[PDB]
Coordinates of C-alpha atoms and ligand atoms in Angstrom, one line a residue:
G2 CA -56.1 -29.3 24.8
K3 CA -54.5 -32.4 26.4
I4 CA -51.7 -32.2 28.9
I5 CA -49.0 -34.4 27.4
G6 CA -46.4 -36.3 29.6
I7 CA -42.8 -36.0 28.5
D8 CA -40.0 -38.1 29.9
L9 CA -37.0 -36.0 28.9
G10 CA -34.2 -38.5 29.2
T11 CA -30.4 -38.2 29.1
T12 CA -30.3 -40.8 26.3
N13 CA -33.9 -41.3 25.1
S14 CA -37.1 -39.3 25.4
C15 CA -40.6 -40.5 25.5
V16 CA -44.1 -38.9 25.2
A17 CA -47.4 -40.1 26.5
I18 CA -50.9 -38.8 26.5
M19 CA -53.9 -39.5 28.7
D20 CA -56.6 -41.2 26.6
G21 CA -59.4 -40.9 29.1
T22 CA -58.4 -43.2 32.0
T23 CA -55.8 -45.2 30.1
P24 CA -52.3 -43.8 29.2
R25 CA -50.8 -44.3 25.8
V26 CA -47.1 -43.9 24.7
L27 CA -47.0 -42.3 21.2
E28 CA -44.8 -43.4 18.3
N29 CA -42.7 -40.6 16.7
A30 CA -42.5 -39.9 12.9
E31 CA -39.8 -42.6 12.5
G32 CA -42.2 -45.2 14.0
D33 CA -40.5 -45.5 17.4
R34 CA -42.0 -45.3 20.9
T35 CA -38.8 -43.6 22.2
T36 CA -36.6 -40.9 20.6
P37 CA -32.9 -40.5 21.1
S38 CA -32.2 -37.2 22.9
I39 CA -29.8 -36.1 20.2
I40 CA -29.8 -32.7 18.4
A41 CA -27.8 -31.9 15.3
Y42 CA -27.3 -28.5 13.6
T43 CA -26.7 -29.0 9.9
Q44 CA -24.6 -26.9 7.5
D45 CA -27.8 -25.9 5.7
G46 CA -29.7 -24.5 8.7
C47 CA -31.8 -27.6 9.7
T48 CA -32.1 -29.0 13.1
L49 CA -32.2 -32.8 13.3
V50 CA -33.6 -34.5 16.4
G51 CA -33.4 -38.3 17.2
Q52 CA -32.5 -41.0 14.7
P53 CA -31.8 -38.5 11.9
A54 CA -29.4 -36.7 14.2
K55 CA -27.9 -40.0 15.3
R56 CA -27.1 -41.1 11.7
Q57 CA -25.0 -38.1 10.8
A58 CA -23.0 -37.6 14.0
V59 CA -19.9 -39.0 12.3
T60 CA -19.8 -36.4 9.6
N61 CA -20.9 -33.6 11.9
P62 CA -19.2 -34.4 15.3
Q63 CA -18.8 -30.8 16.5
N64 CA -22.5 -29.9 15.9
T65 CA -24.3 -33.0 17.1
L66 CA -25.3 -32.6 20.7
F67 CA -26.1 -35.4 23.2
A68 CA -26.2 -36.0 26.9
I69 CA -27.2 -32.3 27.4
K70 CA -29.2 -33.4 30.5
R71 CA -25.8 -33.9 32.1
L72 CA -24.9 -30.2 31.5
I73 CA -28.3 -28.6 32.2
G74 CA -28.4 -26.3 35.2
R75 CA -24.6 -26.8 35.9
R76 CA -21.6 -24.5 36.1
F77 CA -18.8 -24.6 33.7
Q78 CA -16.3 -25.0 36.5
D79 CA -18.1 -28.0 38.1
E80 CA -15.8 -31.0 38.4
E81 CA -18.3 -33.1 36.3
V82 CA -18.5 -30.5 33.6
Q83 CA -14.8 -30.0 33.5
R84 CA -14.3 -33.8 32.9
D85 CA -16.9 -33.7 30.1
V86 CA -15.2 -30.8 28.3
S87 CA -12.3 -33.0 27.2
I88 CA -14.5 -36.0 26.4
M89 CA -17.3 -34.5 24.3
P90 CA -16.8 -34.0 20.5
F91 CA -18.9 -30.8 20.8
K92 CA -17.5 -27.7 22.5
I93 CA -18.5 -27.0 26.1
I94 CA -18.0 -23.3 27.2
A95 CA -18.6 -20.9 30.0
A96 CA -21.6 -18.6 29.7
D97 CA -21.2 -15.0 30.8
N98 CA -22.6 -15.9 34.2
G99 CA -20.3 -19.0 34.5
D100 CA -23.0 -21.5 33.5
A101 CA -22.1 -24.5 31.4
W102 CA -23.1 -23.8 27.8
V103 CA -22.3 -25.2 24.4
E104 CA -20.9 -23.6 21.3
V105 CA -22.4 -24.6 17.9
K106 CA -21.1 -23.1 14.7
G107 CA -19.7 -20.1 16.7
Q108 CA -23.0 -19.5 18.6
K109 CA -23.1 -19.8 22.4
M110 CA -26.1 -21.8 23.4
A111 CA -27.7 -22.6 26.7
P112 CA -28.6 -26.3 27.5
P113 CA -32.3 -25.3 27.9
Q114 CA -32.4 -24.2 24.2
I115 CA -30.9 -27.5 23.1
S116 CA -33.2 -29.6 25.3
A117 CA -36.1 -27.5 23.9
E118 CA -35.4 -29.0 20.5
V119 CA -36.1 -32.5 22.0
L120 CA -39.2 -31.2 23.8
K121 CA -40.4 -29.7 20.5
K122 CA -40.1 -33.1 18.7
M123 CA -42.1 -34.7 21.5
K124 CA -44.7 -31.9 21.3
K125 CA -45.0 -32.3 17.5
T126 CA -45.2 -36.0 17.9
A127 CA -48.2 -35.6 20.2
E128 CA -49.7 -33.0 17.8
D129 CA -49.3 -35.3 14.8
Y130 CA -51.2 -38.0 16.7
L131 CA -53.9 -35.8 18.2
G132 CA -54.5 -33.7 15.2
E133 CA -54.6 -30.5 17.3
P134 CA -52.2 -28.1 19.0
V135 CA -50.6 -29.1 22.3
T136 CA -49.6 -26.2 24.6
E137 CA -49.3 -27.9 28.1
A138 CA -47.0 -30.5 29.4
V139 CA -45.8 -32.4 32.5
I140 CA -42.0 -32.8 32.2
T141 CA -39.9 -35.2 34.2
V142 CA -36.6 -34.7 36.0
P143 CA -34.4 -37.0 38.2
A144 CA -35.5 -37.0 41.9
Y145 CA -32.1 -35.8 42.9
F146 CA -32.0 -32.7 40.6
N147 CA -31.2 -29.5 42.4
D148 CA -32.9 -26.1 42.1
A149 CA -30.9 -24.9 39.1
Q150 CA -31.4 -28.2 37.3
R151 CA -35.1 -28.1 37.9
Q152 CA -35.6 -24.5 36.8
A153 CA -33.4 -25.0 33.7
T154 CA -35.6 -27.9 32.7
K155 CA -38.8 -25.8 33.3
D156 CA -37.1 -23.1 31.1
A157 CA -36.5 -25.7 28.4
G158 CA -40.3 -26.4 28.4
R159 CA -41.0 -22.7 28.0
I160 CA -38.5 -22.3 25.2
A161 CA -40.3 -25.2 23.4
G162 CA -43.6 -23.3 23.6
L163 CA -44.9 -25.4 26.4
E164 CA -46.6 -24.3 29.6
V165 CA -45.1 -26.6 32.2
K166 CA -48.0 -27.6 34.4
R167 CA -45.7 -29.7 36.6
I168 CA -42.1 -30.8 36.9
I169 CA -42.4 -34.3 38.2
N170 CA -39.7 -36.5 39.8
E171 CA -38.9 -39.6 37.8
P172 CA -39.4 -42.3 40.4
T173 CA -42.6 -40.7 41.5
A174 CA -43.9 -40.8 37.9
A175 CA -42.9 -44.5 37.7
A176 CA -44.8 -45.1 40.9
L177 CA -47.9 -43.4 39.4
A178 CA -47.6 -45.7 36.4
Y179 CA -47.3 -48.7 38.6
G180 CA -50.0 -47.8 41.0
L181 CA -52.5 -47.2 38.2
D182 CA -53.7 -50.7 38.0
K183 CA -51.5 -52.5 40.5
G184 CA -51.6 -52.6 44.2
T185 CA -53.6 -51.2 45.5
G186 CA -52.0 -53.0 48.4
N187 CA -51.3 -50.2 50.8
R188 CA -47.8 -51.2 49.6
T189 CA -44.4 -49.7 50.3
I190 CA -42.1 -49.7 47.2
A191 CA -38.5 -49.0 46.3
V192 CA -38.0 -47.5 42.9
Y193 CA -34.5 -48.0 41.5
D194 CA -34.0 -45.8 38.5
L195 CA -30.7 -46.1 36.6
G196 CA -30.7 -44.4 33.3
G197 CA -28.3 -43.2 30.7
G198 CA -27.2 -40.3 32.9
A199 CA -28.8 -40.2 36.3
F200 CA -29.4 -42.5 39.2
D201 CA -32.4 -42.2 41.7
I202 CA -33.7 -44.3 44.5
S203 CA -37.1 -43.4 46.0
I204 CA -39.0 -45.2 48.8
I205 CA -42.7 -44.6 48.2
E206 CA -45.8 -45.6 50.2
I207 CA -49.0 -46.2 48.2
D208 CA -51.9 -46.6 50.5
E209 CA -55.5 -46.9 49.1
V210 CA -58.2 -46.0 51.6
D211 CA -61.8 -45.7 50.5
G212 CA -60.9 -45.6 46.8
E213 CA -58.4 -42.7 47.4
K214 CA -54.8 -43.5 46.4
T215 CA -52.2 -41.7 48.4
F216 CA -48.7 -41.8 46.9
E217 CA -46.2 -40.5 49.5
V218 CA -42.5 -40.3 49.0
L219 CA -40.9 -41.3 52.3
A220 CA -37.3 -40.8 51.1
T221 CA -35.3 -40.1 48.0
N222 CA -31.6 -40.2 47.2
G223 CA -29.3 -40.7 44.2
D224 CA -26.6 -39.3 41.9
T225 CA -27.5 -37.1 39.0
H226 CA -24.2 -37.8 37.3
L227 CA -24.1 -41.7 37.4
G228 CA -25.5 -43.6 34.5
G229 CA -25.2 -45.7 31.3
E230 CA -22.8 -43.2 29.8
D231 CA -20.4 -44.0 32.6
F232 CA -20.7 -47.7 31.9
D233 CA -20.0 -47.0 28.3
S234 CA -17.0 -44.9 29.3
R235 CA -15.4 -47.8 31.3
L236 CA -15.6 -50.1 28.3
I237 CA -14.3 -47.4 25.9
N238 CA -11.3 -46.9 28.1
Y239 CA -10.6 -50.6 28.2
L240 CA -10.7 -50.8 24.4
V241 CA -8.3 -47.9 23.9
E242 CA -5.8 -49.4 26.4
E243 CA -6.1 -52.8 24.7
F244 CA -5.7 -51.3 21.3
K245 CA -2.7 -49.3 22.5
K246 CA -1.0 -52.6 23.5
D247 CA -1.9 -54.7 20.4
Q248 CA -1.3 -52.0 17.8
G249 CA 0.8 -49.3 19.5
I250 CA -1.7 -46.6 18.7
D251 CA -3.6 -44.1 20.8
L252 CA -7.0 -44.1 19.1
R253 CA -8.4 -41.1 21.0
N254 CA -6.8 -38.4 18.8
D255 CA -9.3 -39.5 16.1
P256 CA -12.8 -38.0 16.6
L257 CA -14.4 -40.0 13.8
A258 CA -13.1 -43.2 15.4
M259 CA -14.1 -42.2 19.0
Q260 CA -17.7 -41.6 17.9
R261 CA -17.9 -45.0 16.0
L262 CA -16.2 -46.5 19.1
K263 CA -18.7 -45.0 21.5
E264 CA -21.5 -46.5 19.4
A265 CA -19.5 -49.8 19.3
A266 CA -19.0 -49.8 23.1
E267 CA -22.7 -49.1 23.8
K268 CA -23.7 -51.8 21.3
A269 CA -21.3 -54.4 22.9
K270 CA -22.6 -53.4 26.4
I271 CA -26.2 -53.9 25.4
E272 CA -25.3 -57.2 23.6
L273 CA -23.7 -58.5 26.8
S274 CA -27.0 -58.2 28.6
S275 CA -28.1 -61.4 26.9
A276 CA -24.9 -62.9 25.4
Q277 CA -22.0 -64.3 27.4
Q278 CA -19.5 -62.8 25.0
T279 CA -19.4 -60.5 22.0
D280 CA -16.9 -58.9 19.7
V281 CA -16.2 -55.2 19.2
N282 CA -15.6 -55.5 15.5
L283 CA -14.8 -52.3 13.8
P284 CA -13.3 -52.5 10.3
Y285 CA -11.6 -49.4 8.9
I286 CA -11.4 -47.7 12.3
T287 CA -8.7 -45.4 10.9
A288 CA -5.6 -45.5 8.6
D289 CA -2.1 -45.0 9.9
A290 CA 1.5 -44.9 8.6
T291 CA 0.5 -47.9 6.6
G292 CA -3.2 -48.2 5.5
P293 CA -6.7 -48.9 6.8
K294 CA -6.6 -50.5 10.3
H295 CA -9.2 -52.7 12.0
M296 CA -9.9 -53.3 15.7
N297 CA -11.3 -56.7 16.7
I298 CA -11.5 -57.3 20.4
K299 CA -13.4 -60.0 22.3
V300 CA -15.4 -58.9 25.4
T301 CA -17.0 -61.3 27.8
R302 CA -19.9 -60.5 30.1
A303 CA -17.5 -61.1 33.0
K304 CA -15.0 -58.6 31.6
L305 CA -17.8 -55.9 31.4
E306 CA -19.0 -56.7 34.9
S307 CA -15.5 -56.3 36.1
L308 CA -15.2 -52.9 34.4
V309 CA -18.4 -51.4 35.8
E310 CA -18.8 -53.2 39.2
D311 CA -17.7 -50.2 41.1
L312 CA -20.2 -48.0 39.3
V313 CA -22.9 -50.5 40.3
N314 CA -21.7 -50.4 43.9
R315 CA -21.9 -46.6 43.9
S316 CA -25.7 -47.0 43.4
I317 CA -26.0 -49.3 46.5
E318 CA -24.9 -46.6 49.0
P319 CA -27.8 -44.2 48.3
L320 CA -30.2 -47.2 49.0
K321 CA -28.8 -47.4 52.5
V322 CA -29.3 -43.7 53.2
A323 CA -32.8 -43.6 51.8
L324 CA -33.8 -46.6 53.9
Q325 CA -32.3 -44.8 57.0
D326 CA -34.2 -41.6 56.1
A327 CA -37.5 -43.4 55.5
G328 CA -37.1 -45.0 58.9
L329 CA -37.5 -48.4 57.2
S330 CA -35.6 -51.7 57.1
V331 CA -35.1 -53.8 53.9
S332 CA -37.9 -56.2 55.0
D333 CA -40.4 -53.3 55.1
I334 CA -40.3 -53.1 51.3
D335 CA -43.2 -54.9 49.6
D336 CA -42.0 -54.3 46.0
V337 CA -38.8 -53.4 44.2
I338 CA -39.2 -51.7 40.9
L339 CA -36.5 -51.2 38.3
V340 CA -36.7 -48.3 35.9
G341 CA -34.2 -47.2 33.2
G342 CA -32.5 -49.1 30.4
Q343 CA -29.4 -49.7 32.4
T344 CA -31.2 -51.9 34.8
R345 CA -31.5 -54.5 32.0
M346 CA -28.0 -55.6 32.8
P347 CA -28.1 -59.0 34.7
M348 CA -25.5 -57.8 37.3
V349 CA -27.6 -54.7 38.2
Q350 CA -30.7 -56.8 38.7
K351 CA -28.6 -59.2 40.7
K352 CA -27.0 -56.6 43.0
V353 CA -30.4 -54.9 43.6
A354 CA -32.1 -58.3 44.3
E355 CA -29.6 -59.3 46.9
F356 CA -29.6 -56.0 48.6
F357 CA -33.4 -56.1 49.1
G358 CA -33.4 -59.9 49.5
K359 CA -36.2 -59.9 47.0
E360 CA -36.8 -60.2 43.3
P361 CA -37.7 -57.0 41.4
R362 CA -41.0 -57.0 39.6
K363 CA -41.0 -58.0 35.9
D364 CA -44.3 -56.3 34.8
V365 CA -43.0 -52.7 34.7
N366 CA -41.8 -51.3 31.4
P367 CA -38.4 -49.7 32.3
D368 CA -38.5 -47.5 29.2
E369 CA -42.0 -46.1 29.3
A370 CA -43.2 -46.1 32.9
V371 CA -41.8 -42.6 33.5
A372 CA -43.5 -41.1 30.5
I373 CA -46.7 -42.9 31.4
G374 CA -46.4 -41.6 34.9
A375 CA -46.0 -38.0 33.7
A376 CA -49.2 -38.4 31.6
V377 CA -51.0 -39.7 34.7
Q378 CA -49.8 -36.7 36.7
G379 CA -51.3 -34.5 34.0
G380 CA -54.5 -36.3 34.3
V381 CA -54.6 -35.6 38.0
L382 CA -54.2 -31.8 37.3
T383 CA -57.1 -31.6 34.8
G384 CA -59.4 -33.9 36.9
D385 CA -59.5 -36.7 34.4
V386 CA -57.9 -38.9 37.1
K387 CA -59.9 -38.7 40.3
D388 CA -59.0 -39.7 43.8
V389 CA -55.2 -39.7 43.5
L390 CA -53.1 -37.8 46.0
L391 CA -49.4 -37.0 45.6
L392 CA -47.1 -36.1 48.5
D393 CA -43.5 -35.7 47.1
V394 CA -40.5 -34.3 48.9
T395 CA -37.4 -32.1 48.3
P396 CA -34.3 -34.2 48.0
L397 CA -31.8 -31.8 49.4
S398 CA -31.5 -29.7 52.5
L399 CA -32.0 -26.0 52.0
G400 CA -30.0 -23.8 54.3
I401 CA -28.1 -20.5 54.6
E402 CA -24.5 -19.8 55.2
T403 CA -23.7 -18.4 58.7
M404 CA -20.7 -17.1 60.5
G405 CA -17.7 -19.3 59.9
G406 CA -18.8 -20.7 56.6
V407 CA -21.2 -23.1 58.3
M408 CA -24.5 -24.5 57.0
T409 CA -27.7 -23.7 58.9
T410 CA -30.6 -25.8 57.8
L411 CA -33.9 -24.1 57.1
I412 CA -35.7 -27.0 55.3
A413 CA -34.4 -30.5 55.8
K414 CA -34.0 -33.0 53.0
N415 CA -37.1 -35.3 52.5
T416 CA -39.5 -32.5 53.7
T417 CA -42.9 -32.8 52.0
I418 CA -43.6 -30.3 49.3
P419 CA -45.0 -27.7 48.7
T420 CA -43.6 -26.2 52.0
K421 CA -42.9 -22.8 53.6
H422 CA -40.3 -21.7 56.0
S423 CA -40.2 -18.1 57.4
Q424 CA -37.4 -16.5 59.5
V425 CA -36.9 -12.9 60.6
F426 CA -33.7 -11.1 59.5
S427 CA -32.1 -7.8 60.5
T428 CA -29.1 -5.5 60.4
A429 CA -25.8 -6.2 62.2
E430 CA -24.5 -2.6 62.0
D431 CA -25.6 1.1 62.3
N432 CA -27.1 2.5 59.1
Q433 CA -26.8 -0.8 57.3
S434 CA -28.4 -0.4 53.9
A435 CA -28.2 -4.0 52.7
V436 CA -28.3 -7.5 54.1
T437 CA -27.0 -10.5 52.2
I438 CA -28.5 -14.0 52.6
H439 CA -26.5 -16.8 51.0
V440 CA -28.8 -19.8 50.2
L441 CA -27.5 -23.3 49.5
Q442 CA -28.5 -26.9 48.9
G443 CA -26.7 -29.9 50.4
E444 CA -26.1 -32.0 53.5
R445 CA -22.5 -30.9 54.1
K446 CA -21.7 -28.8 57.2
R447 CA -19.7 -26.2 55.4
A448 CA -21.1 -23.8 52.8
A449 CA -18.2 -24.3 50.4
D450 CA -19.1 -28.0 50.1
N451 CA -22.7 -27.4 49.1
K452 CA -24.5 -26.1 46.0
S453 CA -25.0 -22.3 46.1
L454 CA -28.3 -21.0 44.8
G455 CA -27.1 -17.4 45.0
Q456 CA -26.7 -14.3 47.2
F457 CA -30.1 -12.8 48.1
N458 CA -29.6 -9.1 48.8
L459 CA -32.3 -7.3 50.7
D460 CA -31.3 -3.8 49.6
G461 CA -32.6 -0.3 50.3
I462 CA -33.1 -0.5 54.1
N463 CA -34.0 2.6 56.0
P464 CA -31.4 4.2 58.4
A465 CA -31.7 2.7 61.9
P466 CA -29.6 1.4 64.8
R467 CA -28.4 -2.2 65.0
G468 CA -31.2 -4.8 64.8
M469 CA -33.9 -2.2 64.2
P470 CA -35.6 -3.5 61.1
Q471 CA -37.6 -6.7 61.1
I472 CA -37.5 -8.3 57.6
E473 CA -39.4 -11.5 57.4
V474 CA -37.9 -13.7 54.7
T475 CA -40.1 -16.6 53.5
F476 CA -38.6 -19.6 51.7
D477 CA -41.2 -21.5 49.5
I478 CA -40.7 -24.7 47.7
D479 CA -43.5 -25.3 45.2
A480 CA -45.0 -28.6 43.8
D481 CA -42.2 -28.6 41.2
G482 CA -39.5 -28.7 43.9
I483 CA -38.4 -25.2 43.0
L484 CA -37.4 -22.5 45.5
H485 CA -39.1 -19.0 45.7
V486 CA -37.7 -16.5 48.1
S487 CA -39.9 -13.5 49.0
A488 CA -39.5 -10.8 51.8
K489 CA -41.7 -8.5 53.8
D490 CA -41.2 -6.0 56.6
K491 CA -42.7 -7.8 59.6
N492 CA -43.9 -4.6 61.3
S493 CA -45.8 -3.0 58.4
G494 CA -46.4 -5.9 56.0
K495 CA -45.2 -3.9 53.0
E496 CA -43.1 -6.2 50.8
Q497 CA -39.3 -6.0 50.6
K498 CA -37.6 -6.2 47.2
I499 CA -35.0 -8.9 46.6
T500 CA -32.0 -8.8 44.3
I501 CA -30.3 -12.1 43.4
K502 CA -26.5 -12.0 42.7
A503 CA -24.0 -14.8 42.0
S504 CA -26.8 -17.1 40.7
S505 CA -27.1 -19.7 37.9
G506 CA -29.7 -19.8 35.2
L507 CA -31.4 -17.8 32.5
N508 CA -33.0 -14.4 33.1
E509 CA -36.4 -13.4 31.7
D510 CA -34.8 -11.4 28.8
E511 CA -32.7 -14.4 27.7
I512 CA -35.7 -16.7 27.9
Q513 CA -38.0 -14.4 25.9
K514 CA -35.3 -14.1 23.3
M515 CA -34.7 -17.8 23.3
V516 CA -38.4 -18.5 22.8
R517 CA -38.3 -16.4 19.6
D518 CA -35.1 -18.2 18.4
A519 CA -36.9 -21.6 18.8
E520 CA -39.8 -20.2 16.7
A521 CA -37.4 -19.1 14.0
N522 CA -35.7 -22.5 14.1
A523 CA -39.1 -24.2 13.7
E524 CA -39.6 -22.0 10.7
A525 CA -36.3 -22.9 9.1
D526 CA -37.0 -26.5 9.8
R527 CA -40.1 -25.9 7.6
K528 CA -37.9 -24.6 4.9
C529 CA -35.5 -27.5 5.1
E530 CA -38.5 -29.8 4.8
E531 CA -39.9 -28.0 1.8
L532 CA -36.5 -28.2 0.0
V533 CA -36.6 -32.0 0.7
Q534 CA -40.0 -32.2 -1.0
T535 CA -38.7 -30.1 -3.9
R536 CA -35.8 -32.4 -4.3
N537 CA -38.2 -35.3 -4.2
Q538 CA -40.3 -33.7 -7.0
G539 CA -37.2 -33.0 -8.9
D540 CA -36.2 -36.7 -8.8
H541 CA -39.7 -37.7 -9.9
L542 CA -39.4 -35.3 -12.9
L543 CA -35.9 -36.6 -13.9
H544 CA -37.1 -40.2 -14.0
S545 CA -40.4 -39.5 -15.8
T546 CA -38.5 -37.5 -18.4
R547 CA -35.8 -40.2 -18.9
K548 CA -38.5 -42.9 -19.3
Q549 CA -40.2 -40.7 -22.0
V550 CA -36.8 -40.0 -23.8
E551 CA -36.2 -43.8 -23.7
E552 CA -39.6 -44.7 -25.0
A553 CA -39.5 -42.2 -27.9
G554 CA -36.1 -43.4 -28.9
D555 CA -35.3 -43.0 -32.6
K556 CA -38.4 -40.9 -33.2
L557 CA -37.1 -38.0 -31.0
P558 CA -35.3 -35.2 -33.1
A559 CA -31.6 -35.1 -32.3
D560 CA -31.9 -31.3 -31.5
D561 CA -34.4 -32.0 -28.9
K562 CA -32.5 -35.0 -27.5
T563 CA -29.4 -32.8 -27.0
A564 CA -31.4 -30.1 -25.2
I565 CA -33.5 -32.4 -23.0
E566 CA -30.4 -34.3 -22.0
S567 CA -28.6 -31.1 -21.1
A568 CA -31.5 -29.9 -19.1
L569 CA -31.8 -33.3 -17.3
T570 CA -28.1 -33.0 -16.5
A571 CA -28.5 -29.4 -15.2
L572 CA -31.4 -30.5 -13.0
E573 CA -29.4 -33.4 -11.6
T574 CA -26.7 -31.0 -10.4
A575 CA -29.2 -28.6 -8.8
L576 CA -30.7 -31.6 -7.0
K577 CA -27.3 -32.3 -5.4
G578 CA -27.0 -28.8 -4.0
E579 CA -29.2 -27.2 -1.3
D580 CA -30.9 -24.3 -3.1
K581 CA -34.7 -24.6 -3.5
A582 CA -35.0 -21.8 -6.2
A583 CA -32.3 -23.2 -8.3
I584 CA -34.0 -26.6 -8.3
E585 CA -37.4 -25.1 -9.2
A586 CA -35.6 -23.3 -12.0
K587 CA -33.9 -26.2 -13.7
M588 CA -37.1 -28.1 -13.3
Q589 CA -39.0 -25.4 -15.0
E590 CA -36.4 -25.3 -17.9
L591 CA -36.6 -29.0 -18.2
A592 CA -40.4 -29.0 -18.5
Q593 CA -40.3 -26.3 -21.3
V594 CA -37.7 -28.0 -23.5
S595 CA -39.4 -31.4 -23.0
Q596 CA -43.0 -30.1 -23.3
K597 CA -43.8 -31.7 -26.6
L598 CA -42.2 -35.0 -25.5
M599 CA -44.3 -35.1 -22.4
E600 CA -47.5 -34.1 -24.2
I601 CA -47.6 -37.1 -26.5
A602 CA -46.5 -39.4 -23.7
Ligands
ATP1 N1 -30.4 -54.1 27.3 C1 -29.6 -53.2 27.9 N2 -28.7 -53.6 28.8 C2 -28.0 -52.7 29.5 N3 -28.1 -51.3 29.3 C3 -28.9 -50.8 28.4 C4 -29.8 -51.7 27.7 N4 -30.6 -51.0 26.9 C5 -30.2 -49.7 27.1 N5 -29.3 -49.6 28.0 C6 -28.7 -48.4 28.5 O1 -29.6 -47.6 29.3 C7 -29.4 -46.2 29.0 C8 -30.7 -45.6 28.5 O2 -31.7 -45.8 29.5 P1 -33.0 -44.9 29.6 O3 -33.5 -44.6 28.3 O4 -33.9 -45.3 30.7 O5 -32.2 -43.6 30.2 P2 -32.8 -42.1 30.2 O6 -34.2 -42.1 30.8 O7 -32.7 -41.5 28.8 O8 -31.7 -41.5 31.1 P3 -31.8 -40.7 32.5 O9 -33.1 -41.2 33.1 O10 -30.6 -41.1 33.2 O11 -31.9 -39.2 32.1 C9 -28.3 -46.1 28.0 O12 -27.1 -46.0 28.8 C10 -28.3 -47.4 27.4 O13 -27.1 -47.8 26.7
MG2 MG1 -35.0 -41.9 32.5

């Protein structure tokens, strides 16, 4: 059926469909156009996604997962992940291959399985609206996502039962959403995307010649670990330091408080985008060697600005680089476009506006443009959106490690994709049976300072003197921005097998297994839902039967009043537990003993 567009966000997720030529954002079951990217695993075997997960995070801190996009496709020993380990209320662990995973109720889980739960909610949302199955999606990622991050996101799509037709870069999608109606003016635009977790800047040319729109990304830069979460973190730190002075208490040793404080800090932050001052007012934050304590701290807009100004400044540097790479000056920009909730902060808008010397547009929805853009991208693939052309780029240099630990660039950053690069490799020694190619992403001159994609071993090479064999290695980057390395003996043309060691990501076996796990979860969810309906029916029966007992009054035999009241009580207890059969049972017993009472009612 339809190709849905899914903005899979660090904080919030959004799904859009292509309704002919006009894109629509869909409301979820709770009635909302966006869904918090939060996943909770309950004590009773249910998975909660979004607002329901959000509400119970305080009672279930270790099993409520959020900001998973900031772990996906990363290594456990990464500096960013290591910092998050001591901050998150859930447990971050090392997978067998060294990847950053999470542990939930004693089960090791890969970030793609967790993100798949969000993707599933979005899929179902679309299916609820369309009244038919959805099997295909366009999924978004930050422009500055690396190979492992992109492939791990694509794997999340697959685990969610989605065929991922395209992985689209977030600013590119926003550009598609903007270029849909609007100019149209052979324009050159800067897309500034600051979200809950990631920051992207893309310079994009949109020229329309003979009713054929061409969207070309000139340059892209960013930081995949800079976002609203970091803004929140600065305010949280300020609050604990203030509380440590005014009460003498370190409040961080309390996980219930932290979580309510995290929500408090984010709420204050958002409040300060329209107020000049607010209060972080949390009563009963925790009880000490006395009794229930309450934090009440005033925070001005200026205080907040002062706490996050350096984070805002860190987003200005990549603008300079991207302008350099695009070969443009600030005055070459026709339009500045802000995307992401974090751009609603007056200071962000102000700093961006004074950098470009130009006001950002006000007619772009910073929450929905990306989802809408994904949906448009899907439309281009089916054909339902004609005369649109997309030329995106890869954001990072791809190279190999050479003698001395030095980087040799094979494909430079900002190269248009899809792209191919071939190079012939050979042996360095007599009877060499294997040659290793160490592939990396990054701009640094030394291999150790860049992101390793893995050791690509061309094994099983026929005996020969030095430099005999001619193995042509081809490096492909597809439309998704993802690398594919293949090899071939130059001379004959017969392929050459490639083994990847020391790499990150899920293998085919893990993925197949995880697909089945997600199907099983979906089935358990059905069971949790059914038990909720049963509890609902049980409560209706309680009430109905009490009204009837009440109405009969004096006329009811004492024997029957005793028995019915006992069975009502028994049902009430079952209804408080989590066992569907026991509820059905006590309901059935209640109906039997109250059968003559109900009959005359
Ligand atoms: N009015 C506001 N003022 C300032 N910040 C806000 C406001 N509303 C939301 N935010 C922040 O913006 C972030 C959410 O933005 P958004 O939903 O665009 O991010 P995302 O797409 O989920 O994240 P990413 O794109 O980084 O993966 C959160 O940090 C949130 O607290
Ligand atoms: Mg986003």
